[PDB]
């Protein structure tokens, strides 16, 4: 078996420093070397390239075979690479650094609503059963739920509330927390968010990790992005607890 002393490699950042060339420099000749690039990718070859969209420290492992022996180094990637990051994620986060908090558009009509959902034969693309007037859900927990997006190591999201989410009878029946009836009707349900979440954006699909939802519980973590720009995030979702019911939500930046 190779001796940890016999083995070496270089990790050289390119003109794009998020793309790193890994080269076997070991004191023994014609070993077979495999790599763990620290980013979920493994490779085999004397010289391979690794790409890291996100600023972080990463552990690279080279394994030489004659037996097998493994050595590691850490690399620091200094800055997020916009060329390898989902563009809509950067709008959600307000940029490649920092964070951006989004809140219900409570001051304008139509920031929450319900209608035939996209699989329903009556779908018309709008919350045609009920559309919330400005401040219509002031008297419940709905507007206390705020969502922060940030690209600190990955597609990260922070969910803050004051310990409650808003839902209806169908939703309350799927959640363990105590339910209360607030001034706006339906149900507040005790629900404490996890300290950290992730998200994915694939085309117009926004998915939240760990069964998260945008303050209003309808049994799904999948949203359809209808509008996303620096001033507005307009979402549809399809209820998993009331077949064929669709919900609409409009978020704007926290001021
Ligand atoms: O048109 C029949 C259609 O109605 C669905 O139920 C709707 C109902 O029409 C809406 O009036 C109702 O709106 C609720 C608001 O009045 C309330 O103030 O706020 C809550 C949100 O907190 C609104 O839900 O919504 C229900 C859907 O939840 C039926 O479900 C559907 O089967 C039927 O075809």
Closest C-alpha to 52, from 21, 24, 23, 73:
21
Beta carbon of 245 within 6 Å of any ligand 1 atom = yes
Beta strands 197-202 and 156-160 are: antiparallel
Experiment used for this model: X-ray
d(CA 127, ligand 1 centre) in Å: 10
Give me the phi and psi of 121, to 5 degrees please.
-60, -20
In CATH, what class is 4-66+68-81?
mainly beta
DSSP state of 144: G
- Ligand 1, atom 6: nearest CA belongs to which residue? 129
Beta carbon of 129 within 6 Å of any ligand 1 atom = yes
A 10 A CB-CB count for 199 gives 21
Distance CA 251, CA 216 (A): 12
- Ligand 1, atom 34: nearest CA belongs to which residue? 116
Beta carbon of 65 within 6 Å of any ligand 1 atom = no
DSSP state of 247: E
Best substitution site from 124, 129, 140, 218 to test ligand 1's pocket, by max atoms within 8 Å of Cβ?
A: 129
d(CA 116, ligand 1 centre) in Å: 10
Q: CA 63 from chain center: how many Å?
A: 33
Distance CA 115, CA 238 (A): 10
Beta carbon of 239 within 6 Å of any ligand 1 atom = no
Best substitution site from 128, 130, 140, 180 to test ligand 1's pocket, by max atoms within 8 Å of Cβ?
A: 130
Judge whether 166 and 217 are in contact, CB under 8 Å: yes
DSSP state of 194: P
Distances (CA, A) of 254 to 96, 101, 135: 18, 6, 16
Distance CA 162, CA 32 (A): 56
DSSP state of 218: S
Closest C-alpha to 2, from 72, 65, 61:
65
Contacts 24+ apart (CB under 8 A), 178-186: 182/139, 182/140, 182/141, 183/139, 183/140, 184/136, 184/137, 184/138, 184/139, 184/140, 184/142, 186/140
Tokens representing 68 are 């097998």
- Ligand 1, atom 15: nearest CA belongs to which residue? 130
Beta carbon of 169 within 6 Å of any ligand 1 atom = no
In sequence order, what are the residues at sequence separation of 6 or more whose Cβ sits closer than 8 angstroms to the Cβ of residue 233? 92, 102, 225, 227, 250, 251, 252
Distance CA 7, CA 9 (A): 7
Judge whether 214 and 251 are in contact, CB under 8 Å: yes
Judge whether 113 and 104 are in contact, CB under 8 Å: no
Distance CA 160, CA 212 (A): 12
- Ligand 1, atom 7: nearest CA belongs to which residue? 129
- Ligand 1, atom 1: nearest CA belongs to which residue? 129
Query: Which atom of ligand 1 is nearest the CA belonging to 140?
Result: 22
């Amino acid at each position: 078996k190779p001796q940890e002393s016999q083995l070496s490699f270089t990790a050289t950042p390119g003109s794009n420093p998020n793309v790193v060339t890994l080269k076997n420099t070991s004191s023994l000749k014609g070993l077979v070397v495999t790599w763990d690039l620290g980013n979920g990718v493994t490779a085999k070859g004397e010289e391979v390239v690794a790409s890291y969209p996100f600023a972080n420290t990463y552990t690279i492992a080279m394994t030489a075979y004659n037996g097998s022996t493994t050595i590691t180094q850490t690399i620091t990637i200094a800055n997020n690479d916009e060329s390898q990051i989902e563009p809509k994620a950067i709008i959600l986060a307000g940029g490649l650094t920092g964070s951006k908090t989004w809140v219900f558009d409570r001051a304008h009509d139509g920031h929450f609503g319900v209608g035939p959902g996209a699989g329903n034969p009556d779908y018309n693309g709008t919350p045609s059963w009920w559309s919330c007037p400005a401040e219509g859900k002031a008297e419940c927990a709905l507007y206390e739920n705020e969502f922060s997006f940030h690209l600190d190591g990955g597609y990260n999201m922070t969910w803050v509330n004051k310990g409650k989410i808003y839902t209806n009878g169908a939703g309350k029946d799927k959640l363990p927390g105590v339910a209360t009836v607030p001034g706006a009707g339906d149900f507040d349900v005790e629900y404490i968010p996890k300290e950290a979440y992730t998200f994915t954006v694939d085309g117009d699909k926004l998915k939240l990790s760990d069964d998260a939802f945008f303050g209003h519980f309808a049994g799904t973590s999948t949203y359809t992005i209808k509008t996303l720009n620096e001033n507005e995030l307009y979402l549809e979702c399809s209820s998993a607890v009331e077949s064929g019911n669709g919900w609409w939500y409009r978020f704007v930046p926290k001021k």
